[PDB]
Design an enzyme around this catalytic site. Structure first.
Site, PDB file in Angstrom:
ATOM      1  N   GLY I  23       0.792  -1.213   0.000  1.00  0.00           N
ATOM      2  CA  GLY I  23       0.000   0.000   0.000  1.00  0.00           C
ATOM      3  C   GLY I  23       0.823   1.260   0.000  1.00  0.00           C
ATOM      4  O   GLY I  23       2.046   1.236   0.141  1.00  0.00           O
ATOM      5  N   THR I  24       0.114   2.366  -0.171  1.00  0.00           N
ATOM      6  CA  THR I  24       0.634   3.711  -0.040  1.00  0.00           C
ATOM      7  C   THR I  24       1.176   3.934   1.377  1.00  0.00           C
ATOM      8  O   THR I  24       0.784   3.235   2.324  1.00  0.00           O
ATOM      9  CB  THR I  24      -0.504   4.684  -0.381  1.00  0.00           C
ATOM     10  OG1 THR I  24      -0.427   5.018  -1.772  1.00  0.00           O
ATOM     11  CG2 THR I  24      -0.467   5.930   0.468  1.00  0.00           C
TER      12      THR I  24
END
Ligand SMILES: [Mg+2]
Ligand SMILES: [Mg+2]
Ligand SMILES: [Mg+2]
Ligand SMILES: [Mg+2]
Ligand SMILES: [Mg+2]
Ligand SMILES: [Mg+2]
Ligand SMILES: [Mg+2]
Lengths: 196, 222, 243, 233, 198, 250, 235, 204, 237
Positions: I23-24
């Site tokens: 993920g970010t």
């Protein structure tokens, strides 16, 4: 029944008579109407004994569970649990409760939950059949920030009047003092308070 | 009905009269109103007779199960909490009024329960239609720290008050003594001051007196 | 992948692999704990390891206050530990409400073991990978230790230890009770019983502890409580003068 | 690796992927292309409808949700019907209970949460449809893109479906022009009709091929088909 | 108020049931058959609250007919009556009880005996030489206590019944429009269509 | 949240075996020996307290359990499965019998209920059979003394004497040699102690052995007096000290 | 529950397979009574005979079953059958006709075959009954929920062997005493043990009640089996 | 009106020397109208007898319920239910219907087959047991019965005498009750045998 | 999910963590009277409307949440958190304490690792706010595990973010003002963007401070945002 809670300089005091009646018969002359729901949160009960005991028991259960998980509940939290029970079950409950507590941050606090299930935060509260006779007297004699002994006296005088006029009230005057100190139970006998 | 409970220095005694009634009529001249919840927790009821017996047995059964499960002698506060919560749920429709008394590892206990599920504690109590007669005796003679003997005498006397002055009570006095050291003692017909006097005549009939239409033997087996 | 390794059904040898795997999970945190009975107290000690320096050390704990009188120490991953703590609290509060007295240590243990048995028997629930050690000064039985595992087993102990290095500590204490011939420590102050516990943890594990490497819970008549860093520091100083 | 890990939505792959959801995303790539774009005053949907035969009707890609909101679809059509119905219900509820027109943004959040439950419940599939949502509300024109993973994003313009990558690149390029197309419904539609062209290996888009929808400042959400689109081919 | 009488003679059970259906100030019908055949040797007559009456009879009819086909057998009159009693006993404590009283007349083939059961809406069942529901019993029980014999023939029973119907026509405040009479014996159920002027 | 295995986890195999039941019976085999011997005037049930730590307190874990005042049980196999079975058995004695007839169930009927609880773990969705065999000993007015075995499948059998767990086959042999129908209870306790000595590895004393009897009424153990037709429980757990007394004379 | 490519039900088939290992039970219907005899599965000296019943069960006063299969499954079914008989008595004030009780029991078995993904009951039953429609009757039911009527039948182990023997010696005009003999002989011939001794048998009759006009179920005490094993000459 | 008055009916039970007796009237009425002259109100499950007075539909229902329950009992237990146990079973069965009770007054008579001791009991409609060792009475003439029994009864009567006593008590009480009578049946129960007599009584 | 590996592990949860790492990057920083939250938003295309795909979420009025991994799983977790905070307020009147709230999320995430019919959550969530007794910052893993943090990061830039976070703890032991923590958050998000540089990004910051927001959760916007962007731009070059 005559019951009251009064805030003072160092905390809060709860007081009550000790008579329960069914009609004109005194079923119990030495009732204990002062009910602990946590260490420093107590209440006085009026209305149906069955209803208010059942409620006080549930509240005590909720506050124990609360303490296990989150730490000491505030007096406001206590009051809110009572209110939730009273409001949500207003159609099969006859319950009037006065909640009184002490903590370090908020000091002495009083909440009254009358028949509707409404909540009212107050410097002092009176309730029960006997209370109607002392509205005038209490309003004339109460001051904020009184000392312990002054507060004990105000309740003593107040409830002796309530007892004098209300046939449903009587017996001994019980009190609980709630402070940083501490929890203290006081009792006062007819032979004393009748001569006031 | 007259039922009393009286605490003494090292225990608790309960007592009851032995009359059941259907309105004005006396059904049982010597029934037992003292009920065991557990070996050392006993119970007397007034109100709906079926209700006091049932609620006593339901809770007795669950108290036995609790004791087995926890490996501990049953406590009087448990009988109380379960009775009161049960009665409360039935919103007075179960017409049980009880004096519940016992000894447990924590000491001795005397409690009252009302059909709507309120409870009280005390050193002396009465319930039943004889409750006022019995309370007047209790209020006259109860002192703090009674001996066992004195407590039996006082409870017994309280029931007599109910027997002689309340039309709802009669016949005999049953007692149960729960002392902290000991086994509970159940004392059935501890007083029997209401013996029926001998009848003036025997009413046994000459055989043949009744007219019989027909007859037959009834088969029991298979 | 046989089904007797994925859910709690029997293997041909009459074993329950998912249960055995759950025991292995209990060590995944590499913390050891021990419990001893005083004359009128009960003490639990657990290692406290705060590896990451971004952590708030005060929120890192494997000791729980179940009720006013019962403490619980857990060996196992925290999520399963918290699940067990929550349930124990709820069971304790409920017992008091229904039966009018405080739930005894052993009875709570029996109850938590019963829940564990169920996961051992029903397919859709996984066991919890935790061992639970319960302590109190019981009002009927005096100081108490009761420990429950993923198998639903439980028993009372004179003293006990749990974790990867469980055995070291166990045999140490075993050696002690051989000498004393009694089933508790003779000592009146819970402070001294805490010191004894810390002392024998130090020998058995051959390690020294600062005030931040330990975590202590004490049960007495009517409180159970945990010690702060400073209370522990004061205990460490006391033991360093003689040993 | 893709082996035992794509049986249901209730299983992670050892890479941390959900294959059932990625497979659902693949049905969108099969669906016929559709374009959405907007300015400050209007939002437009353009869809290429697809026939099953030369004897058939081209199946509809645009669904009205409220007076200020509607969407276009690419993927499983009956999945679009489930979601637009839910959205119609949410719009309605907001009107009846709060006398409030539902924010396009809240419509996004709601669809997202609904898609989400299907990416985590045993014995149910994810939704297999992509949606483009347009509306005019209290903060103006809006366009949203919805993926069955539950990801919803607010965009000035976008395209989904087969060959949609052309249209997207075109819109990426045109951006600074169409964003300012204000108070001119017909120019914005023309820009949408042109954007959809960059996605044709097909044919020359006909009076049946074409579905256009519009909503904005003083225009309820409305669907154009057949004769009413000819003036854009 | 609906006349429902039954008399059991030596070789048959006779049922007679009034023909009127009255609502308010109007007689709506004068040929009402207050009867359902349950099985070829068992007949039930009924009276009570307006809708409940037929609904109950037909429901019972459906049930006994079901049994017959399942077992390829005819339940005894005693069994049908027990079954019927139980349905009424359950009904009396349900939300809306069936307000129906019934007579069951049956010929039992296993025993070769006629049998008559009287059951009211509470599920009170009794087996009787003769019976009635409603006010009609206030006249007929005493008449039959006098005139009835255990060994009467079917024709004697019909005379005895004619006597009961006469008494009711003379003394009952309501016009019940005659009865329909049915005989149940070994050869089944048949209607005596001549009673109005027999 | 909510079950996924609504199907039987015990199914039949091609040969007609019920695998899970067999495998539980294997668990019983691994378990510590327990036994029961029936006499003219009593039943004795006995087992070994295989402790898990010397640091554990073996008195806190009872393998012999009172089910009713006149009925006791012991087991071999998985202890936790036993513990919950005992809970349910005590309860079902009340819910299915005492709350109906105002008396405690006869031995065979309670056994029958336990058997049912076990049978259901064999048929219901999403569960494994219990990993235990129980021996249940009891008295009742109309049947006298009895001894029953109950197995993971839900089968029960009445026994004059039997043994379960580890050394069961040798112990069953030692019992067939020694049992007769004139045995007094003291004699049967003796035989039980002898049989158990073969099975026991380590120390053999009143702290490592657990033993209970179904004998006559203990009117003391009742807890109250004054009701003459109540004479007290017939179930009795022998004490540590009581056991050692019979081990000297062994 | 599922079908095989052959249109057979696996779990049912395997349940029948299980039953063929269980002790043999035999039922013979005569004109004045019925016989139920069963062999107990490899016992031991210590097993209590005097308070044992694993193969023969009373359903009401006029109906009994002989069991072959899992006892625990049989008790489940027996109990529901007992209830079913009492419901019928309460509803109609007549004892349940034998077929009706057999059909209901069979239907409960059929159910497990068709829905719910539970295993079938591993049980086969021989029912021995009397009613006033058909007099003496004998029926059999197996885990499939199928049931059939018989003059003589066996279940459990060696049925094929036991069936041929019954076929051979069975005659319509038989008295119950002749049926007693036939059943004991047939078990004697088909045991997988030295001899068929009393301690390995359960035995019951449904007779015309000594001298009455009434039906009586005699469940033989061990002593009676030893004595009846004397008469028929197998000591 | 009052459910326990609609149908009429009395039952009475007495103990004597090694026997018990139980008697009942035969009336079944519907308020003022007498309907049946043959409605018996005493039943028996093995050697245990049960009389029931009250609403007749419930009399019939409880008989069927107790046949059902005692049949199952004998099947599982392999013996006939004894008087004491049956008493308990009646009580719990009644209480089960606490807030929708059967309108009945049951009476139990019998000899314990093991101790041989005579036993009787009564119940209110919700199962409350009247444990009395001399006589139990029930029905619309219970006042009349209590009166008759309290004067007529003496303990340890021989079966032939106890027969006179119970009959006289029943007949005379019935004759002061508009809703009872119309025939009477009396059971004398001796361990070994049970004799049943129909009494001749006023037919009004 | 309900399945333990032969060595006591749970592979499904371990795989759920892989979704998070993927993920970010997002972070939270505890300051002297509050907490600051920041997150990297990848600008996929110029067509994404700026400032308008808000990732940071409020719970009640006093709690911020940020998460990395599957976004829908985070929104699910926040819906559940909002319900759980409402139920607390309804009964006890007071807004939910951060430790109380933590455990509510904890128990819920842990529940999704007990049953074969459910998958664990594919997020790690960083959350906190101000209560009756101070500021709190928490991080919650797919297993349900959570602890209190001085600073926290998760997602792809996790490693460098933690390194930066660790420096601050060393330089400022005397607590970091709320306004400083904002700047530093913008900086740290820049210094974890290095990895995912191929595509452009946009910065989101929110804070909850006793003296700066009155203990309410607020979004950093306008001049404060621009100033924190400038700080990070100047401190990366
Ligand atoms: Mg007064
Ligand atoms: Mg009196
Ligand atoms: Mg499991
Ligand atoms: Mg699972
Ligand atoms: Mg009466
Ligand atoms: Mg009369
Ligand atoms: Mg991280």
């Amino acid at each position: 029944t005559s019951i009251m809670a009064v805030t003072f300089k160092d905390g809060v005091i709860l007081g009550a008579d000790s008579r329960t009646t069914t009609g004109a018969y005194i079923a119990n002359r030495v009732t204990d109407k002062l009910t602990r729901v946590h260490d420093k949160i107590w209440c006085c009960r009026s209305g149906s004994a069955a209803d208010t005991q059942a409620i006080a028991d549930i509240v005590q259960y909720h506050l124990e569970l609360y303490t296990s998980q989150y730490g000491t509940p505030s007096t406001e939290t206590a009051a809110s649990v009572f209110k939730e029970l009273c409001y949500e079950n207003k159609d099969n409950l006859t319950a009037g409760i006065i909640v009184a507590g002490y903590d370090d941050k908020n000091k002495g606090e009083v909440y009254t939950i009358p028949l509707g299930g409404s909540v009212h935060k107050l410097p002092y509260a009176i309730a029960g059949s006997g209370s109607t006779f002392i509205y005038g007297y209490c309003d004339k004699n109460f001051r904020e920030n009184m000392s312990k002994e002054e507060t004990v006296d105000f309740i003593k005088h107040s409830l002796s009047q309530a007892i004098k006029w209300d046939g449903s009230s009587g017996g001994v005057i019980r009190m609980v003092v709630l402070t940083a100190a501490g929890v203290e139970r006081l009792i006062f006998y007819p032979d004393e308070y009748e001569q006031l | 009905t007259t039922i009393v409970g009286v605490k003494f220095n090292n225990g608790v005694v309960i007592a009851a009269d032995t009359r059941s009634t259907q309105g004005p009529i006396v059904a049982d001249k010597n029934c037992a109103k003292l009920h065991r919840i557990s070996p050392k927790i006993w119970c007397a009821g007034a109100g709906t007779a079926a209700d006091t017996e049932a609620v006593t047995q339901l809770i007795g059964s669950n108290i036995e199960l609790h004791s087995l499960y926890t490996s501990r002698e049953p406590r009087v506060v448990s009988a109380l909490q379960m009775l009161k919560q049960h009665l409360f749920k039935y919103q007075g429709h179960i017409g049980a009024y009880l004096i519940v008394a016992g000894v447990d590892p924590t000491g001795s206990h005397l409690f009252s329960i009302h059909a709507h599920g309120s409870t009280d504690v005390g050193y002396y109590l009465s319930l039943g239609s004889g409750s006022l007669a019995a309370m007047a005796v209790l209020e006259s003679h109860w002192k703090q720290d009674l001996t066992k003997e004195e407590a039996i005498k006082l409870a017994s006397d309280a029931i007599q008050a109910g027997i002689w002055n309340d039309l709802g009570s009669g016949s005999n006095v049953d007692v149960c003594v729960m002392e902290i050291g000991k086994d509970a003692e159940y004392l059935r017909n501890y007083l029997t001051p209401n013996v029926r006097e001998e009848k003036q005549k025997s009413y046994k009939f000459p055989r043949g007196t009744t007219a019989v239409l027909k007859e037959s033997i009834v088969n029991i087996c298979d | 992948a046989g089904y007797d390794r994925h859910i709690t059904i029997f293997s041909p040898e009459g074993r329950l692999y998912q249960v055995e795997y759950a025991f292995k999970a209990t060590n995944q945190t590499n913390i050891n704990s021990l419990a001893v009975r005083g004359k009128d107290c009960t003490v639990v000690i657990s290692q406290k390891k705060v590896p990451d320096k971004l952590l708030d050390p005060t929120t890192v704990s494997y000791i729980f206050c179940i009720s006013r009188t019962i403490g619980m120490v857990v060996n196992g991953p925290i999520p399963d530990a918290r699940n067990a703590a929550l349930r124990a609290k709820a069971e304790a509060a409920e017992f008091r409400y229904k039966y009018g007295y405080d739930m005894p240590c052993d009875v709570l243990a029996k109850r938590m073991a019963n829940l564990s048995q169920i996961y051992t028997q029903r397919a859709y629930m996984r066991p919890l990978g935790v061992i639970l050690t319960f302590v109190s000064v019981d009002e009927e039985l005096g100081p108490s230790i009761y420990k429950t595992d993923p198998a639903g087993y439980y028993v009372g102990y004179k003293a006990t230890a749990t974790g990867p290095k469980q055995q070291e500590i166990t045999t140490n204490l075993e050696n002690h009770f051989k000498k004393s011939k009694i089933d508790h420590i003779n000592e009146e102050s819970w402070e001294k019983v805490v010191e004894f516990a810390i002392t024998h943890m130090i020998d058995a594990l051959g390690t020294e502890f600062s005030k931040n490497d330990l975590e202590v819970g004490v049960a007495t008549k009517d409180k159970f409580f945990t010690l702060s860093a400073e209370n522990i520091e004061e205990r460490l100083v006391a033991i360093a003068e003689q040993d | 690796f893709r082996n035992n890990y794509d049986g249901d939505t209730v299983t992670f792959s050892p890479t941390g992927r959900l294959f059932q959801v990625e497979y659902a995303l693949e049905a969108i790539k099969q669906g016929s292309v559709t374009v959405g774009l907007r300015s400050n005053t209007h939002a437009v949907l353009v869809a290429l409808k697809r026939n099953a035969d030369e004897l058939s009707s081209y199946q509809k890609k645009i669904i009205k949700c409220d007076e200020h909101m509607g969407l276009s679809l690419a993927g499983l059509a009956p999945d679009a019907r489930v979601l637009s119905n839910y959205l119609r219900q949410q719009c309605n509820y907001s009107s009846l209970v709060f006398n409030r027109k539902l924010a396009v943004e809240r419509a996004g959040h709601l669809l997202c949460d609904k898609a989400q439950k299907n990416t985590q419940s045993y014995g149910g599939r994810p939704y297999g449809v992509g949606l483009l949502i347009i509306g005019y509300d209290k903060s103006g024109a809006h366009l949203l893109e919805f993926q069955p993973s539950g990801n919803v994003t607010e965009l000035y313009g976008t395209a989904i479906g087969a060959r949609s990558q052309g249209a997207k690149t075109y819109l990426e390029r045109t951006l600074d022009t169409f964003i300012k197309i204000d108070g001119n419904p017909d120019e914005l539609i023309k820009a949408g009709v042109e954007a959809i062209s960059q996605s044709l290996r097909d044919e020359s888009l006909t009076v049946d091929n074409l579905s256009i929808a519009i909503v904005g400042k003083d225009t309820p959400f409305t669907i154009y088909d057949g004769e009413a689109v000819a003036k854009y081919i | 108020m609906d006349i429902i009488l039954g008399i059991r003679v030596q070789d048959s059970v006779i049922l007679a049931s009034s023909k009127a259906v009255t609502r308010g100030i109007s007689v709506l019908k004068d040929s009402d058959d207050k009867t359902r055949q349950l099985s070829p040797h068992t007949l039930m007559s009924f009276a009570g609250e307006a809708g409940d009456t037929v609904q109950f009879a037909e429901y019972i009819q459906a049930n006994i007919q079901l049994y017959s086909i399942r077992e390829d057998y005819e339940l005894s009159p005693q069994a049908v009556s027990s079954f019927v009693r139980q349905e009424l006993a359950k009904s009396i404590r349900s939300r809306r009880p069936y307000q129906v009283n019934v007579l069951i007349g049956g010929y039992d083939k296993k025993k070769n005996k006629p049998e008559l059961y009287q059951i009211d809406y509470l599920g009170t069942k009794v087996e009787l030489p003769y019976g009635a529901h409603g006010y009609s019993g206030f006249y007929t029980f005493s008449l039959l206590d006098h005139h009835y014999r255990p060994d009467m023939t079917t024709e004697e029973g019909l005379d005895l019944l004619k006597l009961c119907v006469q008494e009711l026509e003379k003394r009952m405040p309501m016009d019940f429009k005659g009865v329909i009479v049915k005989i149940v014996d070994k050869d089944g159920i048949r209607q005596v269509d001549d009673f109005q002027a027999q | 949240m909510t079950d996924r295995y609504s199907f039987s986890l015990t199914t039949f195999s091609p040969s007609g075996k019920l695998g899970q039941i067999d495998y539980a019976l294997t668990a019983v085999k691994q378990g510590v020996t327990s036994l029961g011997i029936k006499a003219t005037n009593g039943v004795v049930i006995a087992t070994e307290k295989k402790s898990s730590s010397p640091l554990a307190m073996s008195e806190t874990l009872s393998k012999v359990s009172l089910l009713t005042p006149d009925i006791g049980a012991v087991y071999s196999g998985m202890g936790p499965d036993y513990r919950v079975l005992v809970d349910k058995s005590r309860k079902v004695a009340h819910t299915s019998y005492k709350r109906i007839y105002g008396e405690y169930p006869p031995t065979k009927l309670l056994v029958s209920e336990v058997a049912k609880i076990m049978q259901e773990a064999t048929q219901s969705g999403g569960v494994r059979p219990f990993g235990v065999s129980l021996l249940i000993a009891g008295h009742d007015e109309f049947n006298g003394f009895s001894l029953y075995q109950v197995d993971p499948s839900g089968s029960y059998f009445p026994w004059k004497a039997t043994a379960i767990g580890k050394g069961s086959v040798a112990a069953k042999t030692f019992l067939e040699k020694r049992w007769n129908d004139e045995l007094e209870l003291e004699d049967a306790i003796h035989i039980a102690l002898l049989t158990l000595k073969e099975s026991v590895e380590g120390e053999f004393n009143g702290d490592t052995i657990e033993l209970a009897i179904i004998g006559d009424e203990n009117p003391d153990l009742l807890g109250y007096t004054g009701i003459p037709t109540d004479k007290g429980p017939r179930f009795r757990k022998l004490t540590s000290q009581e056991i050692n007394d019979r081990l000297e004379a062994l | 529950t599922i079908f095989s490519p052959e249109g057979r039900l696996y779990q049912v088939e395997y349940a029948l397979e299980s039953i063929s290992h269980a002790g043999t039970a035999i039922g013979i219907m005569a004109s004045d009574g019925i016989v139920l005899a069963a062999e107990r599965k490899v016992t031991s000296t210590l097993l209590e005979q005097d308070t044992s019943t694993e193969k023969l069960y009373k359903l009401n006063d006029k109906i009994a079953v002989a069991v072959a299969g899992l006892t625990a499954d049989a008790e489940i079914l027996i109990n529901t059958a007992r209830i079913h008989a009492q419901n019928y008595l309460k509803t109609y004030n007549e004892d349940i006709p034998v077929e009706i009780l057999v059909r209901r029991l069979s239907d409960i078995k059929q159910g497990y075959t068709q829905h719910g993904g539970l295993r079938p009951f591993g049980v086969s039953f021989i029912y021995a009954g009397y009613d006033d429609r058909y007099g003496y009757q004998l029926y059999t039911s197996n885990p499939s929920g199928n049931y059939t009527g018989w003059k003589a039948i066996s279940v459990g182990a060696n049925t094929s062997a036991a069936q041929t023997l019954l076929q051979m010696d069975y005659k319509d005009d038989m008295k119950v005493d002749d049926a007693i003999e036939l059943a004991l002989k047939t078990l004697s011939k088909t045991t997988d043990s030295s001899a068929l001794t009393y301690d390995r048998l359960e035995f019951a009759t449904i007779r015309k009640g000594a001298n009455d006009g009434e039906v009586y179920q005699k469940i033989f005490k061990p002593q009676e089996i030893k004595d009846i094993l004397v008469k028929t000459g197998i000591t | 009106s009052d459910p326990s008055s609609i149908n009429g009916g009395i039952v009475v039970a007495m103990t004597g020397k090694d026997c018990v007796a139980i008697a009942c009237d035969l009336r079944l009425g519907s308020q003022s109208l007498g309907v049946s002259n043959k409605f018996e109100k005493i039943f028996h499950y093995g050697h245990v007898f049960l009389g029931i007075t009250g609403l007749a539909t419930d009399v019939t229902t409880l008989n069927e319920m107790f046949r059902y329950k005692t049949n199952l009992y004998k099947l599982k237990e392999e013996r006939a239910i004894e008087p004491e146990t049956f008493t308990q079973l009646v009580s719990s069965s009644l209480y089960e219907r606490r807030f929708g009770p059967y309108f009945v007054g049951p009476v139990v008579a019998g000899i314990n087959s093991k101790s041989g001791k005579p036993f009787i009991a009564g119940f209110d409609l919700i199962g409350c047991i009247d444990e009395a060792k001399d006589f139990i009475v029930s029905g619309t003439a219970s006042d009349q019965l209590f009166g008759m029994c309290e004067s007529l009864y003496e303990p340890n009567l021989e079966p032939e005498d106890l027969f006179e006593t119970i009959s006289q008590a029943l007949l005379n009480a019935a004759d002061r009750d508009a809703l009872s009578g119309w025939g009477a049946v009396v059971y004398i129960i001796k361990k070994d045998e049970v004799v049943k007599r129909y009494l001749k009584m006023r037919q009004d | 999910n309900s399945v333990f590996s032969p060595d006591g592990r749970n592979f499904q949860v371990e795989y759920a963590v892989k979704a998070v790492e993927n993920g970010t990057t997002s972070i939270g920083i505890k300051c002297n009277d509050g907490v600051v939250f920041a997150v990297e938003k990848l600008i996929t295309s110029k067509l994404l409307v700026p400032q308008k795909n808000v990732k940071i979420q409020v719970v009640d009025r006093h709690i911020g949440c940020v998460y990395s991994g599957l976004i829908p799983d985070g929104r699910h977790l926040v819906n559940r958190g909002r319900e759980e905070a409402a139920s607390f307020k309804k009964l006890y009147k007071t807004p939910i304490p951060i430790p109380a709230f933590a455990d509510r999320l904890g128990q819920y995430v842990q529940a999704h690792t007990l049953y074969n019919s459910v998958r664990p959550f594919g997020v790690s969530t960083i959350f906190g706010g101000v209560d009756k007794n101070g500021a709190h910052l928490y991080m919650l893993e797919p297993s349900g595990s959570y602890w209190g943090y001085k600073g926290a990061a998760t997602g792809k830039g996790r490693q460098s973010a933690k390194a930066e976070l660790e420096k601050l703890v060393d330089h400022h032991p005397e607590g970091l003002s709320a306004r400083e923590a904002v700047k530093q958050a913008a900086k740290i998000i820049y210094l974890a963007h290095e990895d995912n540089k191929e595509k452009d990004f946009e910065l989101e910051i929110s804070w909850c401070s006793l003296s700066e927001t009155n203990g309410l959760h607020k979004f950093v916007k306008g001049d404060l945002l621009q100033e924190a962007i400038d700080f990070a731009q100047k401190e990366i070059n």
